[PDB]
Design a protein around this ligand. Structure first.
Ligand SMILES: Cc1cc2nc3c(=O)[nH]c(=O)nc-3n(C[C@H](O)[C@H](O)[C@H](O)COP(=O)(O)OP(=O)(O)OC[C@H]3O[C@@H](n4cnc5c(N)ncnc54)[C@H](O)[C@@H]3O)c2cc1C
Ligand SMILES: CC(=O)N[C@@H]1[C@@H](O)[C@H](O)[C@@H](CO)O[C@H]1O
Ligand SMILES: CC(=O)N[C@@H]1[C@@H](O)[C@H](O)[C@@H](CO)O[C@H]1O
Ligand SMILES: *[C@@H]1O[C@H](CO)[C@@H](O)[C@H](O)[C@H]1NC(C)=O
Ligand SMILES: *[C@@H]1O[C@H](CO)[C@@H](O)[C@H](O)[C@H]1NC(C)=O
Ligand SMILES: *[C@@H]1O[C@H](CO)[C@@H](O)[C@H](O)[C@H]1NC(C)=O
Ligand SMILES: *[C@@H]1O[C@H](CO)[C@@H](O)[C@H](O)[C@H]1NC(C)=O
Ligand code: NA
Ligand code: NA
Ligand code: NA
Length: 483
């Protein structure tokens, strides 16, 4: 453990009270807790272990290995499958998704920031604060990246924007949380500027419910340690005073609300959970962004550098590598991601065990506009593969496999046959539905939710930049509302 305030001692952690209890030490949770700790006492409860000293996390070229080695309760990735049949995974380790993701770093658009109603200046400062710790501008493009960039330009995904963090229509190079030595910088590194006298980071602590005082007012949380012991830990008894803040992710935060008795009464009744607040929209309107792709096998890992943002920001073209087998075997893909799907579904409990997955149903391509936009995206992949740049590329493994540029039926077939997540699932505690613009749960005091469960739309081409940013931003806003 590189930070002295990281601990496994749940008894000792729960014997103290805290100004803030942050549930989930992930992409939003780490910078949030670090920021709060500069002035106030903070406990972070993280269900998983430490990312440090784990080669499968530190090494960029191990990206995807963890996804093949999941277990029920302990592994740093936890597999799940949506009710639609689409396999996926979520992090279970300090650092959250940043410990297991493809590392790609790209900011939300100015339109997104405007729609979210965030303060522009603070958003910019908050991104900068994360970037100076965890974001890296590539020194050199791989041969694969060079070909994809050249090809996207030749395919008319314009303008060419060079390297930029910003979300602009056209083709660009962007940053990564992988450094020039191929080492991953997870959100847990954002704990570096925490005040070590004020923060406690308890690992292997699965939070099972928010507790309320005898509007309901949150008073603390209960968590289960790895040894089957559950402990309660409490808040330190127009500024709001102490608060519980959920940063347990798109799946974790709605699940925890439900387990806490905050949700649709009928569903809570089914699981014999005492009602605290009937909040029907908890776990509603959730969404995942589907990809369609072509894939080939390679012995080379090329980390993500390039993204094509198609006209109207409608589809995102990216060319990932992922570990498939132990030089190692990798799958290289070109995907199109549907940027702004209409299709939505719902999250529900499957059990009262706080370690289990909730059920999630995404209704992929239930709205036909989404399926047509998939075909629109695949049309671009087909043009990309036809470019002189892709055809000449010695790095590409696609020389075998053409897509007929003028056969929409065949592209619709690719949409169906390759339907997958790219792990951008979000919603379930949505701003304007479950929380307000200050991330406060509607109808409850001293309870906030600041993570991907709050998003209507996935920010940027890939969301981790905005999620880390938001944790830092809300940290600052909370500090600020104290004068
Ligand atoms: C395989 C994969 C690849 C990805 N690739 C990229 C990419 O290249 N670029 C990009 O921008 N985004 C990428 N993402 C997405 C990005 O990583 C996530 O959207 C982001 O991490 C979400 O942040 P969060 O804080 O909402 O949740 P998380 O980062 O998942 O953090 C939630 C944390 O809460 C913990 N937790 C959950 N429930 C509880 C509980 N009850 N008690 C205690 N702790 C709990 C979890 O263990 C976790 O650490 C990827 C995701 C995955 C899974
Ligand atoms: C453990 C902890 O954070 N304790 C604080 C205490 O330092 C502070 O004086 C008081 C003021 O309301 O709130 C509480
Ligand atoms: C093994 C292989 O080359 N292709 C598979 C295909 O058979 C399967 O339908 C699909 C399911 O995700 O994954 C890909
Ligand atoms: C995980 O689930 C499987 C079947 O559901 C079972 O074999 C296994 O013992 C479970 N528990 C643990 C702690 O691994
Ligand atoms: C949590 O602790 C239990 C008991 O020590 C252990 O078996 C388990 O692997 C731990 N889980 C994590 C995430 O480290
Ligand atoms: C790798 O790609 C092949 C071909 O599409 C696919 O069948 C396989 O599931 C992929 N493997 C992994 C682990 O992603
Ligand atoms: C995959 O696994 C082993 C090591 O785990 C690797 O050495 C070998 O190339 C692979 N075997 C096949 C053909 O799947
Ligand atoms: Na354009
Ligand atoms: Na759409
Ligand atoms: Na955006």
């Amino acid at each position: 453990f590189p930070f002295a305030f990281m601990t496994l001692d749940g008894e000792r952690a729960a014997a103290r009270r805290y100004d803030y209890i942050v549930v989930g030490g992930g992409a939003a949770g780490c910078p949030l807790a670090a920021t709060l700790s500069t002035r106030y006492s903070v406990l972070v409860l993280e269900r998983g272990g430490s990312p440090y000293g784990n080669p499968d996390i530190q090494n960029a070229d191990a990206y995807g290995k963890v996804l093949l080695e999941t277990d029920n309760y302990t592994s740093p990735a936890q597999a799940f499958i949506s009710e639609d049949g689409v396999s996926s995974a979520r992090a279970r380790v300090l650092g959250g998704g940043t410990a297991i993701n493809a590392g790609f770093y790209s900011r939300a658009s100015s339109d997104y920031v405007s729609n979210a109603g965030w303060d522009e200046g603070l958003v910019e400062e908050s991104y900068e604060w994360v970037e100076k710790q965890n974001a890296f501008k590539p020194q050199h493009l791989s041969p694969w990246s060079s070909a994809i960039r050249d090809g996207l330009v030749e395919a008319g995904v314009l303008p060419y924007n060079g390297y930029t963090l910003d979300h602009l229509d056209g083709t660009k190079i962007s940053a990564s949380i992988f450094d020039s030595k191929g080492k991953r910088h997870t959100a847990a590194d954002l704990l570096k500027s925490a005040n070590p006298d004020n923060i406690v980071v308890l690992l292997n602590a699965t939070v099972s419910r928010v507790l309320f005082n005898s509007k309901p007012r949150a008073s603390g949380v209960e968590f289960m340690d790895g040894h089957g012991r559950s402990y309660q830990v409490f808040l330190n008894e127009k500024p709001k005073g102490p608060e519980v803040i959920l940063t347990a992710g798109a799946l974790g935060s709605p699940q925890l609300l439900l387990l806490s008795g905050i949700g649709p009464s009928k569903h809570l009744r089914e699981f014999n959970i005492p009602l605290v607040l009937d909040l029907p929209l908890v776990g509603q309107r959730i969404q995942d962004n589907p990809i369609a792709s072509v894939t080939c096998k390679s012995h080379h890992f090329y980390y993500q550098q390039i993204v094509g943002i198609t006209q109207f920001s409608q589809n995102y073209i990216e060319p990932p590598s992922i570990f498939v087998n132990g030089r190692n075997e990798y799958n290289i893909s070109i995907f199109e991601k549907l940027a702004f799907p209409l299709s939505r579904g719902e999250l529900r409990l499957r059990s009262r065990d706080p370690r289990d997955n909730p059920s999630v149903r995404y209704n992929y391509y239930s709205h036909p506009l989404d399926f047509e936009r998939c075909v629109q995206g695949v049309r671009v992949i087909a043009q990309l593969l036809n470019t002189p740049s892709l055809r000449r590329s010695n790095a590409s493994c696609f020389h075998g496999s053409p897509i007929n540029m003028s056969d929409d039926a065949a592209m619709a077939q690719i949409c169906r046959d390759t339907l997958s997540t790219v792990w951008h699932y979000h919603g379930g505690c949505e701003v304007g539905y479950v929380v307000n613009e200050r991330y406060q749960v509607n109808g409850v005091d001293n309870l906030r939710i600041v993570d991907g469960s709050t998003y209507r739309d996935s920010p940027g081409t890939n969301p981790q930049a905005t999620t880390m940013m938001l944790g830092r931003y809300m940290g600052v806003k909370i500090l600020q509302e104290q004068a």
